[PDB]
Motif scaffolding. Structure first.
Motif, mmCIF file in Angstrom:
data_model
loop_
_atom_site.group_PDB
_atom_site.id
_atom_site.type_symbol
_atom_site.label_atom_id
_atom_site.label_comp_id
_atom_site.label_asym_id
_atom_site.label_seq_id
_atom_site.Cartn_x
_atom_site.Cartn_y
_atom_site.Cartn_z
ATOM 1 N N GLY B 7 0.779 -1.199 0.000
ATOM 2 C CA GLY B 7 0.000 0.000 0.000
ATOM 3 C C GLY B 7 0.826 1.272 0.000
ATOM 4 N N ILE B 9 -1.267 3.815 -0.471
ATOM 5 C CA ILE B 9 -2.588 4.410 -0.464
ATOM 6 C C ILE B 9 -2.788 5.522 0.534
ATOM 7 N N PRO B 11 -4.830 7.174 3.160
ATOM 8 C CA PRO B 11 -5.876 6.668 4.064
ATOM 9 C C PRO B 11 -7.085 7.564 4.141
ATOM 10 N N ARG B 12 -8.241 7.010 4.492
ATOM 11 C CA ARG B 12 -9.439 7.836 4.553
ATOM 12 C C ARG B 12 -9.214 9.116 5.348
ATOM 13 N N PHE B 73 -11.831 1.809 -4.072
ATOM 14 C CA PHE B 73 -10.678 2.704 -4.136
ATOM 15 C C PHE B 73 -10.907 3.697 -5.242
ATOM 16 N N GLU B 83 -8.180 5.699 -0.506
ATOM 17 C CA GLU B 83 -8.888 4.600 0.115
ATOM 18 C C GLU B 83 -10.362 4.923 0.167
ATOM 19 N N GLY B 86 -12.264 0.422 0.894
ATOM 20 C CA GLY B 86 -11.159 -0.492 1.108
ATOM 21 C C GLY B 86 -11.369 -1.864 0.506
ATOM 22 N N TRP B 87 -10.617 -2.840 1.013
ATOM 23 C CA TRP B 87 -10.576 -4.208 0.504
ATOM 24 C C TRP B 87 -11.586 -5.179 1.016
#
Lengths: 171, 171, 171, 171
Positions: B7, B9, B11-12, B73, B83, B86-87
């Protein structure tokens, strides 16, 4: 004593739509009407619009493997209404929340920068009055733009702006 | 038994996302990835892209009344991944059928008339490689265009053309 | 935001509820409603249902040590809704993850091998339209069985099959 | 296939109502509500109030030769509303002047030396709002007690005094 009352619609067979295999029903009188655009090319003659209605159905059935075209009715710039799944059968135009409780009508074309002609606008308004006259829609039924309920640009900026002025529009 | 720092990424909390209210879970490993576009304005700096990610969430949550921004995403023209759900959380980006069995990634912009920059493409491919590494995605995952599963112009002509070439794309 | 009243509910005093001691509040409007069963004795008369409401509250308060009956509302087979913690106060019906973000309603009695009578189901459903009318519940609210968010047979095999058909049910 | 109506009105069939032959229709929205008592026997359970609606309707149909039970709705001391001629069929509760304009609701029992339980009163208040929500009752409506509109002892002494304390009640 006038019973039939309402509207002029081009039937499925008239546009040679494949036989539908959707069996899921709506509950009349339906509360909601969702307006979308096709986002595709527009058509201005009966010959072109029936062609298109067949193109649209083709994408949803051929490609997406749907039971029939997504919309309950389609609106050509030829000023006719093409029958989709109709008043009685749950469409696939607005997703899980709005589909089971609304009638989806789609104007054939792209109204991001272009308005539909007065005749296409009359065709859709007269179709709704017909839906009310038949008891397929509630007398106090509400019109949503597609973008009001799904993330999307549909029914295009120019058509979204028009449907907003409508007697039954409620965002 | 290997977890790597795949990642890169955002983050929120860093893009200042509103708290998600979503609780439905995806089961890993997820077989499908669905590539859409926001059909919105593009952003090319971590700052404006942080704001664009905010706006997209503001649409989905405030107007549409959804638990979170629809996508798992989001991709920026700045070359960073934002994000979303997410996953592990079911997204709301490609209908009832696909939403439960896929990851949805959307490129922030409208790609009917532009191609996204090489960096956004790199971000997207790297994101997906990360998911396989983490076991979020099957090693042989499949990539679908948003228009392949739902009637829409998304992911946009130019971008759709690109994904069709991808190693993991599947008719 | 709206003065008009909505629905009929047997107030706390009417069923002789002990005073509550709960203060934690729910954040309006609530997304989720969780449907449960007491798994306890059932009742069919306003007299017998008020008694049963009292017994459940009593069990919760005295044996379990809770600030009030755990459920926001209870539903009796007499077809009346019994006010519990109400719309504003966090219940204790679905665990720590769900309690803060839901309204829990519980049909009084055990529904593994029985169905609640149609009047109970109307009352339950009517209560929810009022939650929405009041702005207590989201317009796009979602209903879940107790079993869908926690490991239990609640709300009972037969009643769980029933709630599955509600317009607002999302596993 | 849809969610129930407001009021948790017991439907005609549920109380084993003989079919209606009434055809005349009220024109909404409707201005007056007239409250009566049946001067019949009273009941406090769903089982007893079903039977009591059946008995009243039986008296009106079989003996008086009427098309249906005279009242638009009946209210039991069980706390439920019982559908009679409903929101749409003109009743026969207050004579020729009243029947065409009003909507008639009757409490099941004699209320000369007695008063309907609070639930029977909540049910009736509930009912009238639901009727506004439906467009059947015009929002600015007036309530009359049977006498105001006809010479009779109904709706009983005590019931008549409470009727006067309602906001909607008119001299």
């Amino acid at each position: 004593e006038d019973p039939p009352a309402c509207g002029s619609i081009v039937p499925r067979r008239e546009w040679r739509a494949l036989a539908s295999e959707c069996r899921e029903r709506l509950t009349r009188p339906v509360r909601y009407v969702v307006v979308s655009h096709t986002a595709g090319s527009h058509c201005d003659t009966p010959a072109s619009c029936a062609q298109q209605a067949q193109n649209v159905q083709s994408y949803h059935v051929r490609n997406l493997g749907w039971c029939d075209v997504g919309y309950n009715f389609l609106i050509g710039e030829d000023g006719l209404v093409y029958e989709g799944r109709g008043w009685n059968i749950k469409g696939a135009h607005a997703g899980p929340t709005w589909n089971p409780i609304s009638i989806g009508i789609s104007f054939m074309g792209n109204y991001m920068n272009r308005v539909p002609p007065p005749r296409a606008l009359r065709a859709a308004q007269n179709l709704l009055a017909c839906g009310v006259a038949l008891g397929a829609l509630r007398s106090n039924y509400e019109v949503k733009g597609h973008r009001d309920v799904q993330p999307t640009l549909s029914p295009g900026d120019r058509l979204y702006e028009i449907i907003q002025t409508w007697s039954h529009y409620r965002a």
